[PDB]
Amino acid sequence: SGFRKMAFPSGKVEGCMVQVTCGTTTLNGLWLDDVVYCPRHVICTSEDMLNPNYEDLLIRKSNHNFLVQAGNVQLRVIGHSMQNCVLKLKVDTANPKTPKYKFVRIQPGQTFSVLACYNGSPSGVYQCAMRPNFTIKGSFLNGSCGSVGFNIDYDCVSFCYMHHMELPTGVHAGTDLEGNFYGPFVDRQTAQAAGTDTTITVNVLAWLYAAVINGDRWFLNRFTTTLNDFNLVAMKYNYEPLTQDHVDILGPLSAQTGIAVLDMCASLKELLQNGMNGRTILGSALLEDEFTPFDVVRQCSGVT
Amino acid sequence: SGFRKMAFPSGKVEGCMVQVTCGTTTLNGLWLDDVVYCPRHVICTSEDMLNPNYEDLLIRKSNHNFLVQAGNVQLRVIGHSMQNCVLKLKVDTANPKTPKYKFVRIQPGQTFSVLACYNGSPSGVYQCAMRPNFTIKGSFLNGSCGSVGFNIDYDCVSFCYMHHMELPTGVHAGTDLEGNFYGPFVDRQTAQAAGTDTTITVNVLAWLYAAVINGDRWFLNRFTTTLNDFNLVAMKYNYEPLTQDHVDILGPLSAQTGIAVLDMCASLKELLQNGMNGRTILGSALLEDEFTPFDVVRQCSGVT
Numbered sequence A, B: 001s002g003f004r005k006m007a008f009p010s011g012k013v014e015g016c017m018v019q020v021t022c023g024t025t026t027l028n029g030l031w032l033d034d035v036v037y038c039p040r041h042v043i044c045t046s047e048d049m050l051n052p053n054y055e056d057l058l059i060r061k062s063n064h065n066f067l068v069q070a071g072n073v074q075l076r077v078i079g080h081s082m083q084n085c086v087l088k089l090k091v092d093t094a095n096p097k098t099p100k101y102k103f104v105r106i107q108p109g110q111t112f113s114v115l116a117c118y119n120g121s122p123s124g125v126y127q128c129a130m131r132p133n134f135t136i137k138g139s140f141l142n143g144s145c146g147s148v149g150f151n152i153d154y155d156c157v158s159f160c161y162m163h164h165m166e167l168p169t170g171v172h173a174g175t176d177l178e179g180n181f182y183g184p185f186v187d188r189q190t191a192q193a194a195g196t197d198t199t200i201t202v203n204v205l206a207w208l209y210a211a212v213i214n215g216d217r218w219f220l221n222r223f224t225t226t227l228n229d230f231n232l233v234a235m236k237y238n239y240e241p242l243t244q245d246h247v248d249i250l251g252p253l254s255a256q257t258g259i260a261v262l263d264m265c266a267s268l269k270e271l272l273q274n275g276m277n278g279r280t281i282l283g284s285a286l287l288e289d290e291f292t293p294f295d296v297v298r299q300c301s302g303v304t
């Protein structure tokens, strides 16, 4: 028993991290097979970042201008190209540590682990959720660009995120591994509105089931509700509307605990309307939304 | 910016995990050089665990009874011995993936990453604190025994914890890598009193400095206090007494923010006496104590 914000073991991803330097900028790259992926802003200087013309800036660059280092060995760059906001540096050597991998575009509300890196070296790992507004509330410093988010399915790493920038509000923005930004963000130093965020209802409910599984049952009540009645409460408290698809994904957790989904919805309704009354749930004094129903089942069953 | 419960990259530890089977029990082992370390209760059956005579139980076991598997290759056991509550299985092959390592006995209040494992395979990684009462509030299921806690200093892994058991209260108990239990715990199925726990004051203060560094300054006030006055408050709220040694370790954070340690103590005093008033600090509605002053500086500077 116990419930923690658990990240995937980062080993397979650590073996892919490289340092990419272009001119005076150094950031992280992901070396998979004979290709190194990194944010395209590696080709800019502080003068360029207000409104960069990436096509023009990339034209002034040749293969020999991109310095790629894996630990202490230099990789030879034989090709370079830009795909959306990522650069793809073809190197002459396939990464011997390349794991079985996929590039996936995760959905808002889904979770993933981040391996924060500086100068191609891993510093730490943490679990994140892609916010409904397509930002991530990560922990990143200068030099962290190019650090990636991923999930692991037994031996396969699905890379879902590459870190690009911190918004003036302290939240983080980035791309999928094809270079497409999550959200409306662009890679330039400008004020950028992150949309209105909401709490991931299905994840909060999944976390309430995790609490029941781990002995925390104080919040359970004698009430039930309907999808319609619950959604009126979710509306008032900036929670995502709950659908039958969400109920269906909560099926395994409903079966494990013997607490019907709408009865758990009634517990959530009372917690939203009344607060916690100074009590805690799984060591938290607020409603946690960064655990999916899958994360809860995985952590409560032991999938390796 | 941003602040997360960050674990160390687990790669160096993943390469050490093996499966150890003895009779009908399977748990995890740590393969370092030509030795496999695992909890000694691997030699017991459910009949034995009420009050095991480990010396006698180990006598009925020969090298060939300990089945050690690293992924899919079988290791040949050439020696076995018991050191406190750990078994040391000498194998004929040094682990080629053995990192630079140390065995350390961490102090209560210190933090470390845990790599939860099942059948010698890593499933997840999370950051923990050794509670003042020598328990850890981890996330462990059946088969997790032998999973280890560690810290990483550039290339050196300091192993500090091996998981042994879950107490009837849902908290976790284990040993250092010499087999000595943290706390008064014994490896037998009996009711075992975990002592009164306290909040790690120095860590809460370190986390308040992390909040200031990351823009959360609402809790800062016009007040100061003294070590004596603050310790009276800490006494009432089951917080560890603050000493000049704690003030000294908070020196770097005091210098970074320009907020004197005793002024931060006065903020903590008001938060303890008044609560949060429905507000949050770094995404938490309670006072976090599982970040040391070192963890805060590391996460806020970028040590890899």
Ligand SMILES: O=C(Cc1cccc(Cl)c1)Nc1cncc2c1CCCC2
Binding pocket: A041, A049, A140, A141, A142, A143, A144, A145, A164, A165, A166, A167, A186, A187, A188, A189, A190, B001
């Ligand atoms: O945001 C950027 C650079 C940048 C500027 C403008 C556009 C783009 Cl795409 C990238 N790097 C960064 C990433 N994550 C965190 C922190 C930083 C830099 C300050 C410290 C925090």
Ligand SMILES: O=C(Cc1cccc(Cl)c1)Nc1cncc2c1CCCC2
Binding pocket: A001, B041, B049, B140, B141, B142, B143, B144, B145, B164, B165, B166, B167, B186, B187, B188, B189, B190
């Ligand atoms: O506690 C034990 C077995 C055990 C029993 C008595 C003494 C000793 Cl040293 C070890 N294993 C375990 C570890 N962590 C978590 C969970 C479990 C088993 C139930 C599920 C949770």
